[PDB]
């Protein structure tokens, strides 16, 4: 197994960007150490500067669902770039995928296109408390909705791979504007609502979460936020970055049937180019400029290309079949990795909702961002590069969720089951 | 003049999206609100959904700057996206590109690259204070960085036009460590940092305003900020979102020889597709996050086509005469509009450096955002829908400046001053 191109191009970057990566959870530093380099990548598969290939199983952090470089989306693509890649005016795209995003998701009857989910969280974030009039935002231990300061408490994904504290160079005052709370603990949120009476501008939170490591709610946790939100006429907002479009067309809202009255969306949504969005009750959406005093723009937000992408993406979505096969492969993979584990002599759980899943090396079961932390991060370091060897691509984190595609065929499948039993067999 | 297609297009969008746009500025407020719907874009011009031919001197917001389309980027794109396009994980184009920024600005030794300028300075006002220890930060009233939340406090850019506050949402709090001076105004400059010994982190702007009409510093403004920020051990931040390859290929930092510790980049680098990034000394940049405690990350950041998209137009602007070229027809254009507007008794001042110009009616001179607020926004928006109607697409704002590109012609500014001598003297 050589790296020699990686290890050289990884070695030049160090030099030239912070830690030789344009994203944090890129580095490998709970991995071991050594990332790999990507020259490119195609349906289920990425393949190594060293010629390397992999089945892949992060899907660029969820915008591949349809498979990489879908020959549709390329093809729309290639027609789209001729007319010029961005306007800085509007365009019918906008309006396109505007409607489908409406039509698709529940909460959603208004939307705000924007180019990442960290500037749609900082929206809605603003938006929330414009809207209430309030200052004070509960957030759960382990989810990360992007790097808005706010956010940037008790946070997940690359914050917790890398094991820092709540980022410095955000003001004590703005910390103090956000309350935490363990996922699936509605006791502890109502104590806040208690503690902070009108207060509360709402609760965000990942209605499925995927950045502490695959975890989803609790039998009546997303119905009693829901409930709890309503009685002190706060707003319930999901972070749908990661499971809009991956957990059903209609992502967690839909699939559970938990109506919040915002929602961010992004990954999916820009069929891999950068875009994100932020929408729901028309009476609150009416705040943002120019319609409101909510004053939020973007340059290059609604550009033709990211439309085309995202629109060619969704109605590869509503194929027949689509969610179905999604669930019939990651729950035989899901299953298969338990099964693997357990024969094998390894403590581990996790589960799987669609083409979302998590495998974590600890009994569990896993209901918070606590019960992850108690994942024996040495064994999955190994396990991840023994992975790697076997040429299957994991996320190099034990606290990221997992992500199937409609390009995974069942060999795939097979040969990733094949690589797991390989490597635990050996750990 | 036939605008049936566009008005029917955005009635439409105005009950998908908040005031059916994707950007404030978008929606024409302050010039009549009939904004004209794109259909497609190529070199210097922008073609209406109605079938109507444009000039364009807004490049889609400062990326356009080697003209709409241009044929070797396309290419570029074309050929890329074959190999996918987002990975998820480091590439060789990077490399390059982080190299080529390296190279090309002066204060930049590190850089990250990330989705927007609104990131990029997201990312730069939280590594200012992580790097100081201090909360404190110095903006200039009319001067645009993003919507980062701790910001709307004096911001410009669509901030002007369309009555726009500290845009809500934004805790009066978060905003509450930000401090603000006039444009060009080094005393009120020095009493701030006197009014708060020990609590500003920095100072940021717009080396070259853009968002509050088109602004050049005075006569050692630049220089004086850069001498007391050392003084008092604070950061000079330079925002060349806009101005940066553009003004110069190393920016204003480059053009006027005043060398900031950090500055934002963006619009340009993308060549059309959604890009920024920060940078600066390096000792500063290790703070970032893998190699430092400040957390920021972004998924989509380092993709593949954007990288493509911003090396091929920074090769293109390091071809011979390029921004000569650019002074050449900028400042027959400004030189034009001015001189017409004296013929045809109209009180009027405005200026270019490189491609970027501006034009107010007003006698001015204008130095800071006050004194562009004296512009007559009644006049300036028959000016614009007059300009439309003879195939001239202007800036819909009497404060954002004017773009020129490598692709407008001769022939093209000709036309320009010919479409603005019949609208001025019927005004
Ligand atoms: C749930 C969630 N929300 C928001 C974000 C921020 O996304 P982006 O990189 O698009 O800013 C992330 C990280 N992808 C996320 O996992
Ligand atoms: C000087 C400056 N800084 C930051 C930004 C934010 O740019 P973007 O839309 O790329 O976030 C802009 C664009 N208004 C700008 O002109």
Redesign the pocket.
């Known amino acids: 197994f050589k790296t020699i191109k990686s290890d050289e191009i990884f070695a030049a970057a160090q030099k030239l960007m912070p830690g030789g990566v344009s994203?944090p959870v890129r580095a490998f530093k709970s991995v071991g150490g050594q990332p790999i380099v990507f020259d490119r990548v195609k349906d289920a598969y990425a393949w190594d500067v060293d010629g390397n290939r992999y089945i892949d199983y992060v899907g660029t952090?969820?915008p591949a669902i349809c498979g990489h470089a879908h020959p549709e989306v390329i093809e729309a693509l290639k027609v789209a770039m001729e007319k010029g890649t961005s306007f800085g005016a509007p365009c019918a795209l906008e309006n396109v995928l505007a409607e489908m995003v409406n039509d698709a998701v529940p909460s959603i009857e208004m939307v705000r296109f924007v180019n990442?989910?960290?500037?749609?969280?900082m929206a809605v974030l603003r938006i929330m408390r414009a809207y209430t009039g309030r200052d004070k935002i509960i957030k759960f231990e382990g989810?990360?909705?992007?790097?808005a300061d706010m956010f940037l408490v008790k946070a997940?994904?690359g914050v917790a791979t890398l094991g820092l504290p709540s980022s410095p160079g955000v003001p004590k005052k703005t910390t103090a504007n956000t309350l935490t709370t363990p996922y699936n603990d509605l006791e502890a949120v109502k104590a806040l609502f208690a503690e902070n009476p009108g207060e509360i501008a709402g609760v965000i939170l990942?209605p499925i979460?995927?950045?502490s490591g695959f975890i989803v709610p609790d039998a009546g946790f997303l119905e009693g936020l829901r409930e709890i939100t309503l009685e002190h006429d706060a707003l319930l907002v999901f972070?749908?970055?990661?499971?809009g479009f991956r957990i059903a067309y209609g992502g967690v809202q839909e699939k559970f049937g938990v109506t919040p009255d915002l929602t961010?969306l992004?990954?999916i949504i820009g069929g891999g180019l950068?875009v994100?969005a932020y929408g729901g009750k028309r009476e609150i959406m009416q705040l943002v400029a120019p319609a409101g005093p909510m004053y939020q723009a973007g340059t290059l937000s609604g550009n033709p290309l990211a439309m085309t992408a995202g629109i060619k993406t969704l109605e590869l979505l509503r194929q027949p079949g689509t969610y179905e096969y999604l669930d019939q492969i990651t729950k035989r993979l899901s299953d298969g990795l338990l099964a693997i584990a357990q024969e094998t002599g390894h403590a581990a759980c996790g589960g799987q909702v669609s083409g979302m899943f998590g495998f974590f090396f600890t009994e569990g079961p896993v209901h918070n961002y606590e019960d992850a932390k108690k994942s024996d991060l040495q064994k999955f370091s190994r396990f991840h590069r023994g992975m790697l060897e076997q040429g299957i691509y994991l996320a190099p984190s034990q606290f990221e969720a997992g992500f199937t595609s409609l390009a995974h065929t069942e060999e795939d499948i097979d040969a990733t089951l094949a690589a797991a039993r390989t490597v635990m067999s050996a750990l």
Not at 239 to 243: G, P
């Open positions: 994203s952090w969820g990442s989910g960290t500037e749609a969280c989810c990360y909705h992007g790097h997940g994904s990942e979460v995927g950045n972070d749908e970055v990661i499971t961010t992004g990954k950068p994100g």
